[PDB]
Description:
Layout: no helix or strand
PDB class: neurotoxin
Keywords: neurotoxin, alpha-conotoxin, nicotinic acetylcholine recepto disulfide bond isomers
Assembly: monomeric
Amino acid sequence: ECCNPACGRHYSC
């Protein structure tokens, strides 16, 4: 959503 859409487009943190 900001930081964790997908861990900033990587995966999801």
